[model samples]
Target: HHWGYGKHNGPEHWHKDFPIAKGERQSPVDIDTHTAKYDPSLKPLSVSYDQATSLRILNNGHAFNVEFDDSQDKAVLKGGPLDGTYRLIQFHFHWGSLDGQGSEHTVDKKKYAAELHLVHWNTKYGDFGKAVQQPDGLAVLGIFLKVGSAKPGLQKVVDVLDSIKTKGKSADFTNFDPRGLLPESLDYWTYPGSLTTPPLLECVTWIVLKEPISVSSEQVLKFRKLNFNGEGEPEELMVDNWRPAQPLKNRQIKASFK
Candidate 1:
């Protein structure tokens, strides 16, 4: 595609096509928890995914993802600054070459090994396409990833990376339950922000969990093997795919839990 993390197609170069790159309310801002306002009325983030099903996993020119079938309310999000339901569509990650310096939303300037994004579209907007153009049509749940003991939950995803090493490759990734990927605590931070990629629409209600889930350092290494290039193209390892944190202009970051 025209947008990527390499060959001058990176984040800084995105404004050429997507002028929204410089728009206010851009995402992945640094969360200085000490300064975050505690909003007691902000409901704890909730999810209902019993009917969810994973169809496939693929490597785009950007991040690899496990996409879901959102034909119905198979998996949906509620509460936490939401007025209606949001449909779960896909999940992907942004990472770096270093284990402790990759997360897009750094807390107190401290990064995690990686970051996970659960992308959803608002139901009221009718569909994902329509939602992307609306101010309140998307909700992205972000989770930080730390280097620690092996995570069986994430192992399922890692095992399939080999089959999708090069860009454009995809394979069956069925019967997967994303519930296992969540952190123990649902405590989080909320703010109005944009998608951290190309076409960076300022539609996302960013719900970033304060608690992170852990995966072994070895497991974190697996994602780096994914190539940004195609099978025969000049190889470029897909490392540091995270966009730098944007300026938090005239916006407030609220803590859902004190």
Candidate 2:
């Protein structure tokens, strides 16, 4: 039995039936916003923004990848348990066909319309693949968006989705700083986990942010129409590209209130 939440599946069966399912940590729980063991002297991202690379887009034909300038690994995450410099690795996302709702993370059993994940790593550990082994190796910023007043920050990204709408078609984006895409509030939840993808490596320190950006109703449609690995079926558009939540292994999630 796979460790997933389905029509007949839940966290209970995951830890018992599956082999890698039994872990000390898991996610998707409504944050209580209260914890005794708090790290009071944590600071914002210390990773050097100068190392932030130019934007580059790649159309793998299934998922559209916009790689950050990882060559510049100057950004360091100081404070808390980190107290080290982390590299600026690439960032990507998982979405659905429609805009109503589709994402891996949930709040209080409620899926928040849609979600975006920005993946980063600790230079003290190395690159994305290497960071998979350390407890404080990775930091992923998560953003949630619901259909409403479109968040202006994301207009640049959504406007270009139409061009790379199909599979195996990518373009180049030069002279752009990704900082413009981040939500205003940098406050976030930090935890240890693994890549949401295969190998399920539990080497990530997740930093899911609270503030969410928005896009127009029509903009969401462009992503829903994406498809990959098509012979002649109009490149089967990708409706939902999100991976379901995985079992949390022996992990303690901590958040920064200040």
Predicted structure with the largest lDDT when compared to the true one: 1
Give per-residue CA lDDT, model 1, range 1-258, as digits (tens): 488877678888999999999999998899998999999888767888788899999999688999999988779999988889999999999999889677999999899999999999999988999999999999999999999988798999999999999989999999999998998898899999999998899999999999999999899999988899999999899999999899999999999877
**Candidate with best TM-score:** 1
Off by over 4 Å in 1: none
lDDT value, candidate 2, whole model? 0.58
Q: Could you tell me which 10 consecutive residues in candidate 2 have the lowest summed lDDT?
A: 2-11
Worst 10 residues of 1 by lDDT: 1-10
TM-score of each: 0.97, 0.76
